[PDB]
Amino acid sequence: VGPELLVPEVPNAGGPATFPGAPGPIGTVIVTPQISGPQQYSLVLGDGVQTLPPLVAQILQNAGSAGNTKPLTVEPSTLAKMPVV
Amino acid sequence: SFISPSGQLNESPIIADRDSGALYVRVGDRLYPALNLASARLITGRPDNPHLVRSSQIATMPRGPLVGIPGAPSSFSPKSPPASSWLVCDTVATQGVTVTVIDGTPDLTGHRQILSGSDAVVLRYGGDAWVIREGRRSRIEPTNRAVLLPLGLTPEQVSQARPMSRALFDALPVGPELLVPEVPNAGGPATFPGAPGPIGTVIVTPQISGPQQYSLVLGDGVQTLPPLVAQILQNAAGNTKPLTVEPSTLAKMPVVNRLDLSAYPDNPLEVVDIREHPSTCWWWERTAGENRARVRVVSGPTIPVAATEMNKVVSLVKADTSGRQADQVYFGPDHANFVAVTSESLWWVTDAGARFGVEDSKEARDALGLTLTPSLAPWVALRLLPQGPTLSRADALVEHDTLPMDMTPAELVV
């Protein structure tokens, strides 16, 4: 038996982030613009951001849609200032 | 003579007991027991093999204390092929690393592959991350997303990389760091008229035939840029687009070639997933008479040695815990016993993996043999083998009653 295929359960979803400059509430998906090379998806957690594989990003957006269909876009210069977790 | 072979004393000065194998050397009218063939040749001065003599004959002649160099080689067979190949292989376990030195041509069969072009691998050493490609190592910083992003890297992938051994780290030559190229006089005025803007800005000229041509306006003129390098410069925010200009005016403006772009690749890196390729090797290749050797990098699932030979790797004792000594040694086909290194120095490497220095003088050479020309080898590899005393006639002429004991030996397991 392997791990069960379920929607990733983000902890304490919806609350405010601890670190400054967070582009949105905890559990939102953020992506880099296409004009600066291959796009990298990421998830905003309480104390920073974590990288996401292209397939998992679609599941989180499809599941957490609630009417939304696209992620937040951030410039490479500002993204580099947020702490990695 | 065929039923029960035997022997008798003759003009030859190196003799051995027909039934006990002990080695003896004559000096005048007295026989001295010698520690090994190397010291026996060096003491008598004749390149020869021991002559078997009847054991009852040796008992009649007078004796003396032991002579020679302890631990010297005991079998000479000079080999020096036309092509010399050496490799230093690093292998990581699923913590800790092992260093293996290979002599002779490597085996490229299987999933093994040469690393070139867009292929690269990331490793950790001294607290820093290094990118390995086209035979060079370049430092990278995990926070500079402006570099990692167009290059196709990920900060997690850069920070979680596996360690690298000191042996391989010193062997690989360093290149310029993967950082945003700093431009001189950036933000200042141009030295030449007609410059479309301040120095450090990117200028582009579209064409009817072929892709767009990017350029950087330097204080003394423009220099052409590759697309991937322009995307790095396009990240600071900075300007949304470069200045668009006519081909003719740009062709009339002065051209410069002052900045160095040698390290940036043409396309996003194809990072090798180390979990499947845990073995990486640095390879040096040279042909006799060529002015320069070829340096390359190889990676794969196992050391570049055939599975049939894999069982004959030699495991050293490694009394030296520092990084200057290898853990394993292997001699493939067309290996070299007699070697010279870049004023030159001569070394003899034994089958057991020890190296001994040989004097350049005619006496030392003529006594051992070694008249043929030695093969070349790189010092960054050869130094990893353990070193013994030099084969100098000036020090083989000694007597001892007993020898000093070896501290810190290692266990022999049956």
Written overview of the protein:
Chain B: One of its GO terms (cellular component) is peptidoglycan-based cell wall. Chain B: Pfam families: T7SS_ESX1_EccB. Chain B: It is found in: Cell inner membrane. This is part of a larger assembly, with 2 copies of chain A. Chain A has helices at 54-63, 76-79, and strands at residues 29-31, 41-44, 49-52, 72-73. With 85 residues, the first copy, chain A, is an alpha+beta fold. The first copy, chain A, starts with 28 loop residues before the first strand and ends in a 6-residue tail after the last helix. Chain A binds chain B through residues 32, 35-38, 40, 51, 75-77, 79-80, 84, and chain B through 143-146, 149-152, 154-156, 159, 231, 234-237, 268.
Key traits:
part of a larger assembly, 2 chains, 85 residues, alpha+beta, 4 strands, 15% strand
How would you concisely characterize the structure shown here?
The PDB classes it as membrane protein. The structure is cut from a larger assembly and holds two copies of chain A. With 85 residues, chain A is α+β, with helices and mostly antiparallel strands.
Strand order of the largest sheet of chain A: 3-2-1-4
Major sheet details of chain A = 4 strands, mixed
Multimeric state: part of a larger assembly
Task: Determine the N-to-C terminus distance of chain A.
Answer: 29 Å
Helix content of chain A: 10-25%
* Major interchain interface with per-chain residue totals: A-B, 13 and 18 residues
The dominant shape of chain A is: globular
Q: Give the H and E element order of chain A.
A: EEEHEH
Report the structural category of chain A. alpha+beta
Round the Cα radius of gyration of chain A to an integer and report it: 13 Å
